[PDB]
């Protein structure tokens, strides 16, 4: 039995997305072990569920010895060599942030693949970052809107680079230059995208002076959770706008007011997921007075969390006001739900440019790059999604992407092929 070790970087979101790969590989008959490095939700709870529902995927918690996780990982290089010495695996699957482990798989002569959870557009940029880094002395926050030109992808305003990379004189930045440099050294690239979604992007990185790549997705990670599904069932087909903004709420209460006044003034049915403004949520302390009373029946506000994958599959959902996280983008495309981009943190501002300019499966929410998105602008874009001809045209474009996706995944498809290509490649020494 061929054995792989998948090394995600610390964090539940990284773990949950490696596990998806792990099930996939063990679904193609590999003995896979997720290696875990614990931070300082719940890791035990996840090992227990994964172990009870997918017993063939086993875990290996290492003796614990953006920023802290880079230190946690450099220092776990000893302990990771111990586990791989006691049984050499056929292949090692790494996160972008786990490049310190490339040192371990050097000596031990073990083929390393990166599992890249963002699309090939984000990879291109991350792969060509160090080159641009040396062609300029200016950091990206200084460069402002000045173009960064990366192979295969639209010019990207420099200030849409991920925050960690915006200031050169910041130890986090140096690590990203380290992890991006180390991407060249790999045997391969497993990307959670499909070629038809990002064709021009795949092509530029499918270069010879660059390790191969295997686009094997969408890999989607598939009580007040049941309630919003019930209320959804209560709505006419395709009539609800879903606003959901990832794992970290970054809306002030006054920004939440604009959203509510804008949603109220659009007339549209809305399913809106709201977290506590930064330093659980008090909706009537936070939202405009009378809002819940006025809009109940027409919309539902959900504290902190909703079953998003379920929600997006529902036939009552006709539009998605998203923060352009990659998993949420995949989940939206695979249900053919058209999108309004409101990127917020991490690499989402990137995703947004590609989502609006390259892929053309969303429209921006003007003001994401500003202090606040206005009630006016929220209302216009929700009107535009549910009512306008552009919206019907856009919902058409997504429908296509839904099918290019469904096709890429079913037998013979471009991603399915890539999957077996990388699995077979793993079985050979
Ligand atoms: O209320 C919520 C918010 C998010 N998600 C899920 O959390 C993941 C978010 O991952 P993504 O990469 O899109 O964004 P991030 O949270 O990393 O910014 C996706 O699977 C969403 O479907 C969810 O189920 N419920
Ligand atoms: C929820 O799951 C994942 C995941 O599995 C992997 C991920 O890898 C990278 C990013 C990212 C974020 C900020 C940045 O500056 C550079 C890269 C990321 O957000 C991310 C993620 O959200």
Tab-separated table of C-alpha atoms and ligand atoms in Angstrom:
chain	number	residue	atom	x	y	z
A	1	UNK	CA	0.000	0.000	0.000
A	2	UNK	CA	1.433	3.341	-1.154
A	3	UNK	CA	1.804	5.830	1.693
A	4	UNK	CA	1.626	9.639	1.640
A	5	UNK	CA	2.121	12.145	4.435
A	6	UNK	CA	0.092	15.356	4.200
A	7	UNK	CA	1.614	18.209	6.276
A	8	UNK	CA	-0.854	21.097	6.623
A	9	UNK	CA	0.117	24.236	8.361
A	10	UNK	CA	-1.399	24.898	11.800
A	11	UNK	CA	-4.945	26.175	11.829
A	12	UNK	CA	-8.277	24.422	11.449
A	13	UNK	CA	-8.934	25.884	7.991
A	14	UNK	CA	-5.651	24.479	6.716
A	15	UNK	CA	-6.287	21.097	8.421
A	16	UNK	CA	-9.866	20.719	7.111
A	17	UNK	CA	-8.626	21.397	3.560
A	18	UNK	CA	-5.713	18.910	3.769
A	19	UNK	CA	-8.164	16.288	5.056
A	20	UNK	CA	-10.242	16.805	1.926
A	21	UNK	CA	-7.145	15.962	-0.093
A	22	UNK	CA	-6.409	13.056	2.252
A	23	UNK	CA	-9.843	11.437	1.812
A	24	UNK	CA	-9.434	11.974	-1.933
A	25	UNK	CA	-6.090	10.172	-2.027
A	26	UNK	CA	-7.232	7.343	0.238
A	27	UNK	CA	-10.282	7.165	-2.034
A	28	UNK	CA	-7.704	6.280	-4.728
A	29	UNK	CA	-6.089	3.708	-2.471
A	30	UNK	CA	-3.321	5.452	-0.632
A	31	UNK	CA	-2.468	5.029	3.020
A	32	UNK	CA	-2.465	8.729	4.001
A	33	UNK	CA	-1.384	10.271	7.325
A	34	UNK	CA	-2.195	13.893	8.053
A	35	UNK	CA	0.621	15.330	10.206
A	36	UNK	CA	-0.688	17.844	12.750
A	37	UNK	CA	1.184	20.742	14.389
A	38	UNK	CA	-1.159	22.238	17.026
A	39	UNK	CA	-1.514	26.040	17.517
A	40	UNK	CA	-1.351	27.798	20.900
A	41	UNK	CA	-11.828	25.535	16.828
A	42	UNK	CA	-10.820	22.221	18.441
A	43	UNK	CA	-8.169	19.827	17.093
A	44	UNK	CA	-9.106	16.768	19.163
A	45	UNK	CA	-12.764	17.107	18.191
A	46	UNK	CA	-11.712	17.024	14.540
A	47	UNK	CA	-9.354	14.048	14.836
A	48	UNK	CA	-12.174	12.169	16.556
A	49	UNK	CA	-14.771	12.876	13.851
A	50	UNK	CA	-12.302	12.235	11.034
A	51	UNK	CA	-11.205	9.020	12.716
A	52	UNK	CA	-14.767	7.782	13.268
A	53	UNK	CA	-16.007	8.711	9.778
A	54	UNK	CA	-12.829	8.018	7.724
A	55	UNK	CA	-10.874	5.474	9.761
A	56	UNK	CA	-8.432	4.772	6.961
A	57	UNK	CA	-7.120	8.354	7.197
A	58	UNK	CA	-4.861	8.319	10.243
A	59	UNK	CA	-3.298	11.242	12.102
A	60	UNK	CA	0.048	11.896	13.721
A	61	UNK	CA	0.132	14.682	16.297
A	62	UNK	CA	3.710	15.928	16.661
A	63	UNK	CA	5.248	16.824	20.021
A	64	UNK	CA	4.759	20.564	20.215
A	65	UNK	CA	8.152	22.127	20.995
A	66	UNK	CA	0.291	34.430	10.629
A	67	UNK	CA	3.523	34.865	12.587
A	68	UNK	CA	3.687	32.293	15.408
A	69	UNK	CA	2.705	29.528	12.986
A	70	UNK	CA	5.846	30.228	10.962
A	71	UNK	CA	7.888	29.681	14.110
A	72	UNK	CA	5.864	26.618	15.193
A	73	UNK	CA	6.688	25.092	11.787
A	74	UNK	CA	10.414	25.854	11.462
A	75	UNK	CA	10.899	24.317	14.916
A	76	UNK	CA	8.803	21.205	14.156
A	77	UNK	CA	11.359	20.155	11.531
A	78	UNK	CA	13.208	17.895	14.038
A	79	UNK	CA	10.030	16.111	15.110
A	80	UNK	CA	8.853	15.719	11.507
A	81	UNK	CA	12.108	14.008	10.497
A	82	UNK	CA	11.704	11.513	13.360
A	83	UNK	CA	8.268	10.471	12.089
A	84	UNK	CA	9.467	10.108	8.492
A	85	UNK	CA	12.639	8.284	9.481
A	86	UNK	CA	10.608	5.620	11.288
A	87	UNK	CA	8.859	4.867	7.940
A	88	UNK	CA	9.663	6.639	4.679
A	89	UNK	CA	6.539	7.641	2.761
A	90	UNK	CA	6.150	7.543	-1.003
A	91	UNK	CA	5.172	11.225	-1.219
A	92	UNK	CA	5.022	14.267	1.038
A	93	UNK	CA	2.242	16.843	0.494
A	94	UNK	CA	3.019	20.329	1.823
A	95	UNK	CA	1.196	23.580	2.397
A	96	UNK	CA	2.688	26.750	0.969
A	97	UNK	CA	3.603	27.725	4.575
A	98	UNK	CA	5.420	24.437	5.282
A	99	UNK	CA	8.518	25.101	3.213
A	100	UNK	CA	10.791	24.558	6.190
A	101	UNK	CA	9.875	20.900	5.770
A	102	UNK	CA	11.496	20.974	2.330
A	103	UNK	CA	14.744	20.747	4.276
A	104	UNK	CA	13.545	17.447	5.783
A	105	UNK	CA	12.439	15.894	2.469
A	106	UNK	CA	15.814	16.818	0.956
A	107	UNK	CA	18.043	14.467	2.987
A	108	UNK	CA	15.347	11.789	3.215
A	109	UNK	CA	14.984	11.924	-0.610
A	110	UNK	CA	11.185	12.180	-0.496
A	111	UNK	CA	9.144	13.733	-3.334
A	112	UNK	CA	7.283	16.810	-2.083
A	113	UNK	CA	4.075	18.157	-3.588
A	114	UNK	CA	2.475	21.438	-2.546
A	115	UNK	CA	-1.274	21.345	-1.984
A	116	UNK	CA	-2.297	24.854	-2.951
A	117	UNK	CA	-5.772	25.824	-1.697
A	118	UNK	CA	-6.017	29.001	-3.792
A	119	UNK	CA	-6.323	29.023	-7.553
A	120	UNK	CA	-3.666	29.116	-10.220
A	121	UNK	CA	-3.941	32.888	-10.496
A	122	UNK	CA	-2.897	33.340	-6.839
A	123	UNK	CA	-0.134	30.729	-7.365
A	124	UNK	CA	1.317	32.559	-10.407
A	125	UNK	CA	1.675	35.737	-8.351
A	126	UNK	CA	3.029	33.861	-5.332
A	127	UNK	CA	5.469	32.015	-7.651
A	128	UNK	CA	6.680	35.255	-9.312
A	129	UNK	CA	6.707	37.338	-6.123
A	130	UNK	CA	10.456	36.896	-5.367
A	131	UNK	CA	11.402	38.000	-8.893
A	132	UNK	CA	9.407	41.231	-8.694
A	133	UNK	CA	10.725	41.583	-5.145
A	134	UNK	CA	14.246	42.191	-6.476
A	135	UNK	CA	13.167	44.308	-9.457
A	136	UNK	CA	12.023	47.048	-7.047
A	137	UNK	CA	12.987	48.633	-3.743
A	138	UNK	CA	9.432	49.859	-3.079
A	139	UNK	CA	7.043	47.878	-0.901
A	140	UNK	CA	3.510	47.113	-2.037
A	141	UNK	CA	1.778	49.507	0.356
A	142	UNK	CA	3.867	52.332	-1.103
A	143	UNK	CA	3.130	51.151	-4.661
A	144	UNK	CA	-0.608	51.682	-4.031
A	145	UNK	CA	-2.497	50.997	-7.264
A	146	UNK	CA	0.613	50.581	-9.360
A	147	UNK	CA	0.401	47.483	-11.559
A	148	UNK	CA	2.012	44.238	-10.591
A	149	UNK	CA	2.261	42.210	-13.793
A	150	UNK	CA	2.140	38.543	-13.233
A	151	UNK	CA	2.114	35.780	-15.884
A	152	UNK	CA	-1.327	34.492	-16.891
A	153	UNK	CA	-3.379	36.919	-14.791
A	154	UNK	CA	-4.674	40.486	-14.931
A	155	UNK	CA	-2.498	43.330	-13.700
A	156	UNK	CA	-3.046	43.379	-9.962
A	157	UNK	CA	-3.001	46.667	-7.999
A	158	UNK	CA	-0.027	46.303	-5.685
A	159	UNK	CA	-2.173	47.123	-2.671
A	160	UNK	CA	-4.273	44.070	-3.470
A	161	UNK	CA	-1.322	41.947	-2.437
A	162	UNK	CA	-2.114	40.067	0.787
A	163	UNK	CA	-1.614	42.294	3.894
A	164	UNK	CA	1.284	40.189	5.292
A	165	UNK	CA	3.218	41.024	2.098
A	166	UNK	CA	2.556	44.805	2.071
A	167	UNK	CA	5.547	45.992	4.140
A	168	UNK	CA	9.038	44.734	3.370
A	169	UNK	CA	10.467	45.567	6.779
A	170	UNK	CA	8.354	43.018	8.571
A	171	UNK	CA	9.537	39.502	9.458
A	172	UNK	CA	6.300	37.989	8.073
A	173	UNK	CA	7.179	39.430	4.665
A	174	UNK	CA	10.579	37.755	4.669
A	175	UNK	CA	8.940	34.400	5.329
A	176	UNK	CA	6.637	34.821	2.330
A	177	UNK	CA	9.717	35.496	0.239
A	178	UNK	CA	11.073	32.281	1.774
A	179	UNK	CA	7.961	30.171	1.074
A	180	UNK	CA	7.563	31.503	-2.463
A	181	UNK	CA	11.242	30.888	-3.288
A	182	UNK	CA	10.785	27.329	-2.010
A	183	UNK	CA	7.817	26.670	-4.329
A	184	UNK	CA	10.264	26.131	-7.227
A	185	UNK	CA	11.971	23.205	-5.448
A	186	UNK	CA	8.891	20.974	-5.437
A	187	UNK	CA	8.137	17.897	-7.504
A	188	UNK	CA	4.618	19.110	-8.245
A	189	UNK	CA	1.653	21.362	-7.546
A	190	UNK	CA	-1.798	20.132	-6.531
A	191	UNK	CA	-4.176	23.109	-6.956
A	192	UNK	CA	-7.818	23.282	-5.836
A	193	UNK	CA	-8.937	24.746	-9.165
A	194	UNK	CA	-10.039	23.391	-12.547
A	195	UNK	CA	-8.299	24.316	-15.792
A	196	UNK	CA	-11.452	25.512	-17.583
A	197	UNK	CA	-12.112	28.003	-14.784
A	198	UNK	CA	-8.582	29.455	-14.920
A	199	UNK	CA	-7.223	28.453	-18.367
A	200	UNK	CA	-4.884	31.379	-19.008
A	201	UNK	CA	-3.627	30.999	-15.435
A	202	UNK	CA	-2.840	27.263	-15.678
A	203	UNK	CA	-0.966	27.874	-18.968
A	204	UNK	CA	1.550	30.432	-17.606
A	205	UNK	CA	2.599	28.166	-14.693
A	206	UNK	CA	2.448	25.051	-16.902
A	207	UNK	CA	5.930	26.267	-17.988
A	208	UNK	CA	8.924	23.929	-18.423
A	209	UNK	CA	11.222	25.865	-16.051
A	210	UNK	CA	8.611	25.127	-13.412
A	211	UNK	CA	7.445	21.923	-11.640
A	212	UNK	CA	4.286	20.363	-13.141
A	213	UNK	CA	0.810	21.017	-11.806
A	214	UNK	CA	-2.368	18.984	-11.320
A	215	UNK	CA	-5.625	20.957	-11.059
A	216	UNK	CA	-7.854	18.499	-9.218
A	217	UNK	CA	-10.875	20.524	-8.065
A	218	UNK	CA	-13.290	21.740	-6.999
A	219	UNK	CA	-12.488	20.021	-3.738
A	220	UNK	CA	-15.352	21.409	-1.670
A	221	UNK	CA	-15.584	20.612	2.049
A	222	UNK	CA	-19.018	18.955	1.787
A	223	UNK	CA	-30.387	24.087	15.765
A	224	UNK	CA	-29.960	27.471	14.020
A	225	UNK	CA	-28.136	25.785	11.150
A	226	UNK	CA	-31.235	23.820	10.197
A	227	UNK	CA	-33.453	26.895	10.752
A	228	UNK	CA	-31.997	28.995	7.947
A	229	UNK	CA	-32.408	25.973	5.660
A	230	UNK	CA	-36.079	25.726	6.663
A	231	UNK	CA	-36.714	29.465	6.158
A	232	UNK	CA	-34.886	29.077	2.837
A	233	UNK	CA	-37.333	26.330	1.817
A	234	UNK	CA	-40.049	28.922	2.580
A	235	UNK	CA	-38.858	31.222	-0.268
A	236	UNK	CA	-39.580	31.268	-3.991
A	237	UNK	CA	-36.970	29.701	-6.220
A	238	UNK	CA	-33.901	31.889	-6.845
A	239	UNK	CA	-35.250	34.835	-4.798
A	240	UNK	CA	-32.775	35.182	-1.886
A	241	UNK	CA	-29.463	37.017	-1.688
A	242	UNK	CA	-26.947	35.293	0.542
A	243	UNK	CA	-24.439	37.548	2.273
A	244	UNK	CA	-21.755	35.587	4.121
A	245	UNK	CA	-18.254	36.731	4.855
A	246	UNK	CA	-15.931	33.951	5.836
A	247	UNK	CA	-14.365	32.922	9.120
A	248	UNK	CA	-13.572	36.374	10.570
A	249	UNK	CA	-16.033	39.225	10.981
A	250	UNK	CA	-14.428	42.548	10.075
A	251	UNK	CA	-17.484	44.788	9.756
A	252	UNK	CA	-17.979	47.651	12.184
A	253	UNK	CA	-21.486	48.176	13.548
A	254	UNK	CA	-21.853	51.313	11.406
A	255	UNK	CA	-20.843	49.355	8.319
A	256	UNK	CA	-23.444	46.786	9.356
A	257	UNK	CA	-26.003	49.617	9.462
A	258	UNK	CA	-25.318	50.583	5.824
A	259	UNK	CA	-25.678	46.967	4.799
A	260	UNK	CA	-29.026	46.664	6.584
A	261	UNK	CA	-30.325	50.001	5.241
A	262	UNK	CA	-29.096	48.997	1.806
A	263	UNK	CA	-30.617	45.540	2.023
A	264	UNK	CA	-33.883	46.961	3.356
A	265	UNK	CA	-34.002	49.482	0.528
A	266	UNK	CA	-33.367	46.851	-2.185
A	267	UNK	CA	-36.665	45.020	-1.581
A	268	UNK	CA	-34.923	41.669	-2.085
A	269	UNK	CA	-35.218	38.655	0.162
A	270	UNK	CA	-31.944	38.230	2.021
A	271	UNK	CA	-30.142	35.627	4.123
A	272	UNK	CA	-27.482	37.578	5.990
A	273	UNK	CA	-24.757	36.130	8.253
A	274	UNK	CA	-23.392	38.681	10.716
A	275	UNK	CA	-20.595	38.296	13.280
A	276	UNK	CA	-19.717	40.471	16.278
A	277	UNK	CA	-17.989	43.704	15.224
A	278	UNK	CA	-14.270	43.619	16.063
A	279	UNK	CA	-12.521	44.989	19.130
A	280	UNK	CA	-21.503	36.443	20.030
A	281	UNK	CA	-23.371	39.274	18.195
A	282	UNK	CA	-26.111	41.511	19.719
A	283	UNK	CA	-28.278	42.077	16.681
A	284	UNK	CA	-30.552	44.715	18.182
A	285	UNK	CA	-27.582	46.506	19.720
A	286	UNK	CA	-25.816	46.440	16.369
A	287	UNK	CA	-28.370	46.800	13.605
A	288	UNK	CA	-30.590	49.789	12.763
A	289	UNK	CA	-33.524	50.213	15.102
A	290	UNK	CA	-36.636	48.474	13.890
A	291	UNK	CA	-34.668	46.558	11.267
A	292	UNK	CA	-35.466	43.045	12.537
A	293	UNK	CA	-39.117	43.982	13.037
A	294	UNK	CA	-39.462	45.630	9.623
A	295	UNK	CA	-37.613	42.965	7.626
A	296	UNK	CA	-38.720	39.769	9.378
A	297	UNK	CA	-40.633	37.768	6.799
A	298	UNK	CA	-38.571	39.282	4.006
A	299	UNK	CA	-35.106	38.409	5.370
A	300	UNK	CA	-33.311	36.358	8.053
A	301	UNK	CA	-30.217	37.509	9.995
A	302	UNK	CA	-27.968	34.675	11.243
A	303	UNK	CA	-25.607	35.070	14.203
A	304	UNK	CA	-21.988	34.199	13.399
A	305	UNK	CA	-22.559	31.018	11.375
A	306	UNK	CA	-24.678	29.420	8.638
A	307	UNK	CA	-24.450	26.114	6.756
A	308	UNK	CA	-22.974	27.808	3.706
A	309	UNK	CA	-22.352	24.762	1.486
A	310	UNK	CA	-25.942	23.660	2.067
A	311	UNK	CA	-27.285	27.208	1.632
A	312	UNK	CA	-25.514	27.718	-1.717
A	313	UNK	CA	-26.903	24.446	-3.096
A	314	UNK	CA	-30.451	25.555	-2.274
A	315	UNK	CA	-32.715	26.533	-5.174
A	316	UNK	CA	-33.955	29.568	-3.286
A	317	UNK	CA	-30.541	31.262	-3.620
A	318	UNK	CA	-30.224	33.550	-6.648
A	319	UNK	CA	-27.161	35.575	-5.648
A	320	UNK	CA	-24.179	35.561	-3.298
A	321	UNK	CA	-22.586	38.614	-1.670
A	322	UNK	CA	-19.262	37.004	-0.877
A	323	UNK	CA	-15.877	37.861	0.566
A	324	UNK	CA	-14.094	35.914	-2.206
A	325	UNK	CA	-12.522	33.310	0.017
A	326	UNK	CA	-11.481	30.526	-2.320
A	327	UNK	CA	-13.603	27.763	-0.782
A	328	UNK	CA	-16.659	30.029	-0.872
A	329	UNK	CA	-15.914	30.836	-4.478
A	330	UNK	CA	-15.673	27.162	-5.410
A	331	UNK	CA	-18.845	26.427	-3.460
A	332	UNK	CA	-20.611	29.247	-5.296
A	333	UNK	CA	-19.426	28.208	-8.767
A	334	UNK	CA	-20.300	24.524	-8.315
A	335	UNK	CA	-23.877	25.595	-7.478
A	336	UNK	CA	-23.929	28.158	-10.284
A	337	UNK	CA	-24.797	31.016	-7.880
A	338	UNK	CA	-23.652	34.420	-9.234
A	339	UNK	CA	-21.566	36.657	-6.960
A	340	UNK	CA	-20.894	40.176	-5.732
A	341	UNK	CA	-17.237	40.445	-4.678
A	342	UNK	CA	-16.574	42.138	-1.327
A	343	UNK	CA	-13.090	40.839	-0.489
A	344	UNK	CA	-11.887	41.512	2.997
A	345	UNK	CA	-8.748	39.807	4.311
A	346	UNK	CA	-6.032	37.251	3.376
A	347	UNK	CA	-5.705	36.852	-0.431
A	348	UNK	CA	-9.362	37.714	-1.121
A	349	UNK	CA	-8.602	41.098	-2.765
A	350	UNK	CA	-6.488	39.114	-5.249
A	351	UNK	CA	-9.264	36.506	-5.763
A	352	UNK	CA	-11.544	39.464	-6.421
A	353	UNK	CA	-9.530	40.920	-9.297
A	354	UNK	CA	-9.362	37.493	-10.894
A	355	UNK	CA	-13.011	36.847	-10.113
A	356	UNK	CA	-14.087	40.111	-11.714
A	357	UNK	CA	-11.536	40.591	-14.513
A	358	UNK	CA	-10.145	37.218	-15.513
A	359	UNK	CA	-12.967	34.752	-14.767
A	360	UNK	CA	-15.806	37.339	-14.979
A	361	UNK	CA	-18.049	35.407	-12.531
A	362	UNK	CA	-18.634	38.341	-10.167
A	363	UNK	CA	-19.019	42.113	-10.001
A	364	UNK	CA	-17.187	44.216	-7.363
A	365	UNK	CA	-18.794	45.890	-4.385
A	366	UNK	CA	-17.344	49.377	-4.704
A	367	UNK	CA	-15.934	50.518	-1.382
A	368	UNK	CA	-14.235	47.302	-0.325
A	369	UNK	CA	-10.991	49.257	-0.746
A	370	UNK	CA	-12.347	52.225	1.205
A	371	UNK	CA	-13.451	53.042	4.777
A	372	UNK	CA	-16.947	51.697	4.254
A	373	UNK	CA	-19.383	50.391	1.670
A	374	UNK	CA	-22.396	52.691	1.429
A	375	UNK	CA	-26.035	51.764	1.886
A	376	UNK	CA	-26.489	53.157	-1.619
A	377	UNK	CA	-23.839	50.899	-3.153
A	378	UNK	CA	-25.058	47.810	-1.274
A	379	UNK	CA	-28.632	48.412	-2.495
A	380	UNK	CA	-27.614	49.035	-6.111
A	381	UNK	CA	-25.584	45.801	-6.294
A	382	UNK	CA	-28.309	43.708	-4.681
A	383	UNK	CA	-30.856	45.219	-7.089
A	384	UNK	CA	-28.393	44.562	-9.898
A	385	UNK	CA	-27.940	40.893	-8.948
A	386	UNK	CA	-31.629	39.995	-8.659
A	387	UNK	CA	-33.292	42.343	-11.158
A	388	UNK	CA	-31.057	43.627	-13.963
A	389	UNK	CA	-30.111	42.219	-17.343
A	390	UNK	CA	-26.449	42.250	-16.455
A	391	UNK	CA	-27.434	39.963	-13.600
A	392	UNK	CA	-29.217	37.485	-15.861
A	393	UNK	CA	-26.231	37.631	-18.213
A	394	UNK	CA	-23.891	37.016	-15.257
A	395	UNK	CA	-26.011	34.189	-13.819
A	396	UNK	CA	-25.661	32.698	-17.302
A	397	UNK	CA	-21.852	32.936	-17.140
A	398	UNK	CA	-21.783	31.115	-13.784
A	399	UNK	CA	-24.116	28.401	-15.095
A	400	UNK	CA	-21.433	27.686	-17.673
A	401	UNK	CA	-18.734	27.547	-14.981
A	402	UNK	CA	-20.963	25.233	-12.930
A	403	UNK	CA	-20.937	22.832	-15.880
A	404	UNK	CA	-17.303	23.209	-16.887
A	405	UNK	CA	-16.761	22.269	-13.216
A	406	UNK	CA	-19.177	19.359	-12.987
A	407	UNK	CA	-17.605	18.106	-16.221
A	408	UNK	CA	-14.003	18.560	-15.103
A	409	UNK	CA	-14.770	16.336	-12.110
A	410	UNK	CA	-16.824	13.535	-13.621
A	411	UNK	CA	-14.968	10.755	-15.467
A	412	UNK	CA	-12.626	11.740	-18.313
A	413	UNK	CA	-12.624	15.379	-17.161
A	414	UNK	CA	-9.551	17.578	-16.988
A	415	UNK	CA	-9.360	17.607	-13.195
A	416	UNK	CA	-10.117	13.883	-12.804
A	417	UNK	CA	-7.296	13.225	-15.258
A	418	UNK	CA	-4.921	15.491	-13.305
A	419	UNK	CA	-5.916	13.622	-10.140
A	420	UNK	CA	-4.970	10.177	-11.467
A	421	UNK	CA	-1.859	11.647	-13.091
A	422	UNK	CA	-0.598	12.885	-9.722
A	423	UNK	CA	-1.682	9.731	-7.873
A	424	UNK	CA	0.098	7.416	-10.333
A	425	UNK	CA	3.094	9.765	-10.251
A	426	UNK	CA	3.115	9.322	-6.449
A	427	UNK	CA	3.309	5.529	-6.687
A	428	UNK	CA	6.605	5.630	-8.619
A	429	UNK	CA	9.786	6.265	-6.630
B	1	LIG	O1	-20.918	31.071	8.235
B	1	LIG	C1	-20.105	30.452	7.544
B	1	LIG	C2	-18.903	31.001	6.983
B	1	LIG	C3	-18.104	30.211	6.246
B	1	LIG	N1	-18.381	28.882	5.999
B	1	LIG	C4	-17.463	28.054	5.192
B	1	LIG	O2	-16.144	28.360	5.579
B	1	LIG	C5	-15.245	28.246	4.453
B	1	LIG	C6	-14.537	29.562	4.247
B	1	LIG	O3	-13.353	29.297	3.478
B	1	LIG	P1	-12.843	30.424	2.467
B	1	LIG	O4	-11.507	30.006	1.970
B	1	LIG	O5	-13.904	30.747	1.481
B	1	LIG	O6	-12.624	31.735	3.361
B	1	LIG	P2	-11.800	32.045	4.715
B	1	LIG	O7	-12.713	31.707	5.866
B	1	LIG	O8	-10.544	31.228	4.599
B	1	LIG	O9	-11.497	33.520	4.603
B	1	LIG	C7	-16.116	27.789	3.275
B	1	LIG	O10	-16.145	26.374	3.126
B	1	LIG	C8	-17.501	28.292	3.686
B	1	LIG	O11	-18.532	27.550	3.061
B	1	LIG	C9	-19.517	28.276	6.518
B	1	LIG	O12	-19.793	27.100	6.321
B	1	LIG	N2	-20.322	29.113	7.258
B	2	LIG	C1	-9.429	28.460	4.811
B	2	LIG	O1	-8.397	27.739	4.138
B	2	LIG	C2	-7.201	28.223	3.645
B	2	LIG	C3	-6.256	27.273	3.205
B	2	LIG	O2	-6.491	25.940	3.277
B	2	LIG	C4	-5.021	27.653	2.719
B	2	LIG	C5	-4.766	28.994	2.608
B	2	LIG	O3	-3.538	29.324	2.108
B	2	LIG	C6	-3.243	30.631	1.985
B	2	LIG	C7	-4.058	31.655	2.285
B	2	LIG	C8	-3.439	32.997	2.265
B	2	LIG	C9	-3.947	33.993	3.098
B	2	LIG	C10	-3.317	35.207	3.261
B	2	LIG	C11	-2.120	35.433	2.613
B	2	LIG	O4	-1.547	36.648	2.820
B	2	LIG	C12	-1.554	34.438	1.826
B	2	LIG	C13	-2.194	33.221	1.686
B	2	LIG	C14	-5.331	31.376	2.874
B	2	LIG	O5	-6.155	32.251	3.218
B	2	LIG	C15	-5.665	29.979	3.001
B	2	LIG	C16	-6.915	29.571	3.518
B	2	LIG	O6	-7.810	30.519	3.884
